[PDB]
Design a protein around this motif. Structure first.
Motif, short mmCIF file in Angstrom:
data_model
loop_
_atom_site.label_atom_id
_atom_site.label_comp_id
_atom_site.label_asym_id
_atom_site.label_seq_id
_atom_site.Cartn_x
_atom_site.Cartn_y
_atom_site.Cartn_z
N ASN B 73 -19.48 -7.03 9.56
CA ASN B 73 -20.43 -5.56 8.58
C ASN B 73 -20.66 -4.26 9.45
N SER B 74 -22.24 -4.96 11.19
CA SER B 74 -22.71 -4.06 11.67
C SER B 74 -22.87 -4.99 12.87
N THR B 76 -25.31 -6.11 14.57
CA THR B 76 -25.94 -7.57 14.30
C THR B 76 -24.97 -8.85 13.65
N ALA B 77 -23.96 -7.90 13.21
CA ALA B 77 -23.03 -9.16 12.67
C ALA B 77 -22.45 -9.27 13.68
N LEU B 80 -23.95 -12.01 16.24
CA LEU B 80 -23.80 -12.98 15.10
C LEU B 80 -22.03 -13.97 15.02
#
Lengths: 308, 308, 308, 308
Positions: B73-74, B76-77, B80
């Motif tokens: 997604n981004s 930060t994604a 993760l």
């Protein structure tokens, strides 16, 4: 004159098991062998998977319907299938499907290869507290050495700059001198065998004391310092390599640093003291200049020791 | 007068490799370095993943269709995603998809970084039975010490309150005294070097006995107790630090607790016995009062030992 | 008269850190503490997960749509969510979804707790080759013992049935006798302190020999066998517990088996030989009868040794 | 005459815990026991899973709808379910579904069995640097041995071909001779007990020297070489097995290779030197011919040593 390639005794006319000690680590090295073994195993599993997917019961791309296993896209896809399965990631969409006899057999052998390969990883080296690459050898021994009159009768000691956490210190001399002597009918035994620790004889080494700084006492008639010393033996010298033995809970691993300190570099002392006090109390922090100690710019070229 | 910062010998005018011993644990400490190394590695993997997802063949958010990998997604994604993959959790919905050349390369290097990072964890410290933080030093040595007449000829012993599972006891004196002496032409060797274990000489230490409670025998002419003792030497004292050596299967790790017990605190004994029986059999449970033993409120300020 | 609960010296009027040695294993025991620590950690993570799922941004059962995380069915489902995540299984359908700030924070702390809990497992005990529960004590020492004339001057040896892979044998006596003596003004020191190894004195123990079978030589005037022996000392006896010391690469761990062998069970020998040859060569397979050796049904109740 | 099956002392008329030392590895062996324990545990879990799937709340093939767990296809499918779950692979499509009380209980016990089985693997043997199968015994000792005149008074030494990284060398004799002697009233003690190291007595062994090549000095009256030697003792011999002791940081593990070298194979020397120089410096590479050293085709059948 070496350490790794000495003990010269044998010619005639010249003049899979890996394991051993070669399984170790070199900081930023020697993990490449592990990773390449990994990738070769992974590629072997992947190629077996691709070939069997070409010849499986459900065949390539599930020509039978209700596939015994989700067939891979290609040979590289089979490589990725292998890596996925063994690395314990397990998506499932591309992985095994409803059980199939041949599929059951292969997948149970794959579980086997996975668990024993994890065993291969757990066979990781432990180059750690027990087997470090940075030896606890913070003891600065000395530099261009000294002789002096040695209180007339071989009385002095060697510098030690030990900082091994200020503890874990207990040593001895052991050691051995070397020179090509002669012997009746034998190979002349090119070895002194005397092991005389003559010199800075002050008696702390053989005495059961924490930090042996001195050397054991070897009286005269073993050293050529009966009459005339200092320069007569300083000029005539081959190898006076000084090695201490038996510190780290045993006499075997110990430390065998060369520290030649030959009589050529034992010239006249010339280390008075750069300390401003010379007796009381200095740093509370750390060492500064290492070795400078025990000058003797007083004994000339000629220096009688015992005969006088 | 210290232990960590002594051995003062050297000034002139003053007056990545981490490893070493600093890789250890401090109970509720020193795991923070491990966890921060973990998170930095994880963030490095995540940022690489985000950048490549911006520049992958399937590009961001699968602009090509049939993505080489499920794009994050981004940023930060991507973090993760990295943590998910390496920590061997492996959902799949957000993870890699049908194999892709660049995706294959990156994922195999990610498997590599995962296995060697697991190796980094297995490189966990073993501060355990071999290397504990709570030393087996349950032996209460003594307190304000005693002299007495020592049976006239230096005969007594020291208190020991060992409870090291009532076993694993075998010691010796070793040790060394200290005082700034003088020597011809040398640095005067500010050290006694005598190592005389004079005092409560009763002969169990050097004798091959399980628990050496006494000290080896050092006859007179080494102690100033020829004539007049007790207070004359009790008042005049600098450091009588008593250290035993060589208990734990070796003389090196041993224990070097200070236990100064200087002659100032060896005043007149004054520990008769708080026991109600004084000879038979007491507890079957545990110790109570530690050290109180060996009074002597009988020898006055003047006390001849040998000369009489 | 014990081993664990001796050394009686101290009463007045009586007459989280777990670690230590208590972190060990008892074959089919002591893994329960590890598993319960595991399950308590897992339940803590699960209950935190359930409470936060009740109070998360996406709330319970994704009331906001496009859930920050796949909410659990219930409290038990949150327990299973925790176990799933930490045990590195990672389905994904019930696990975390598209990243969410609070979800990001919690999941990164969960990765942290997972890696350090894996560290907790790697802190598994190694009760192994170094620390076994089955001691290498295959040496049958003896049984009801023997005296004989000892060649008149204390000459015999003790039986040894060592089968420690027929190697790894090197021992000594050390040891210590015990009896409540008296001493001037002291606590009488209820201890012999003599440590006389009188008896089967044949000289292999102190001699640097592989397997010390005999005991060191202790001449008479230390044993009451000047005149009259055997039964006079066999009847009068308290404790003649025989303990050897220093076999396993050190004198400290060694073995301290009691082996009382008191003079009451040293009655007259009575072990001639059940061997059919008595001198040549017997088994090539294994031992049969252990101890029977060294009869003496010839010396009567009265038996002079040295005085004669 | 053996090593494993000696020490013959005991007959009368003859004439689960596995652990111990039998938990080890034999290169391409002894992992089969581990793998079979693995597969038996896996099959136990699988059969329990199949039986419970036959008797679960959702029953076989989810007869209730919204299954408590994805039921397996068959008994083999339950085996694969077990292996999947425990091996930390975790697809999910065939694995557990929405939580169910009995399903919750079983799955938490399965997590328990998984973590302790991983503990069983971590209980892998470490037959490594500490416990290798290839002993550091690169020292070629000798072959058909030599006697010579020994400089008249037992002066010679033994060949050593040590290449143990040219370090880690420190040994002693220890050892023990053997012969069936006689003794008053005892079992005659079929053992020499003298432990005389007579022969190539040149004094390096007991001296604290790095590499003891010689043997300690044993003067005459212990060897039958008063007058007449060489062949008179070469023909009359039973066992002169030569064993050195105490090299590897301890006298216990050491090395106990037989090396019989009986006087029959100590015939007249006959190893002059195949070296072309015999004294200076040879290889810088490696050994060639091992043992050939110390001829003596000069002393005839009769050879007086001391009596002359």
């Amino acid at each position: 004159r070496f350490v790794k390639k000495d003990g010269h005794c044998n010619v005639q006319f010249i003049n899979a098991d890996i394991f051993t000690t070669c399984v170790d680590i070199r900081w930023r090295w020697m993990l490449v062998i592990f990773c390449l073994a990994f990738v070769l195993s992974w590629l072997f599993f992947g190629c077996v998977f691709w070939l069997i997917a070409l010849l499986h019961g459900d065949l390539d791309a599930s020509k039978e319907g209700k596939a015994c296993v989700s067939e891979v896209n290609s040979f590289t896809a089979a490589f990725l299938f292998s890596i996925e399965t063994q690395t314990t990631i397990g998506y499932g969409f591309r992985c095994v499907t409803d059980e199939c006899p041949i599929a059951v057999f292969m997948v149970v052998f794959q579980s086997i290869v996975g668990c024993i390969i994890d065993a291969f990883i757990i066979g990781a080296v432990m180059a750690k507290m027990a087997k470090p690459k940075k030896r606890n050898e913070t003891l600065v021994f000395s530099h261009n050495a000294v002789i002096a009159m040695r209180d007339g009768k071989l009385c002095l000691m060697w510098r030690v700059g030990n900082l091994r956490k200020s503890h874990l210190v207990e040593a001895h001399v052991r050691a051995q001198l070397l020179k090509s002597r002669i012997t009746s009918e034998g190979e002349y035994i090119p070895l002194d065998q005397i092991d005389i620790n003559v010199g800075f004889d002050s008696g702390i080494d053989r005495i059961f004391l924490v930090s042996p700084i001195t050397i054991v006492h070897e009286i005269d008639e073993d050293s050529p310092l009966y009459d005339l010393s200092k320069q007569d033996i300083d000029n005539a010298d081959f190898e006076i390599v000084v090695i201490l033995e038996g510190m780290v809970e045993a006499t075997a691993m110990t430390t065998q640093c060369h520290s030649s300190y030959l009589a050529n570099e034992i010239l006249w002392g010339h280390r008075y003291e750069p300390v401003l006090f010379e007796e009381k109390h200095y740093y509370k922090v750390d060492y500064s200049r290492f070795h400078k100690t025990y000058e003797v710019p007083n004994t000339p070229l000629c220096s009688a020791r015992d005969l006088a």
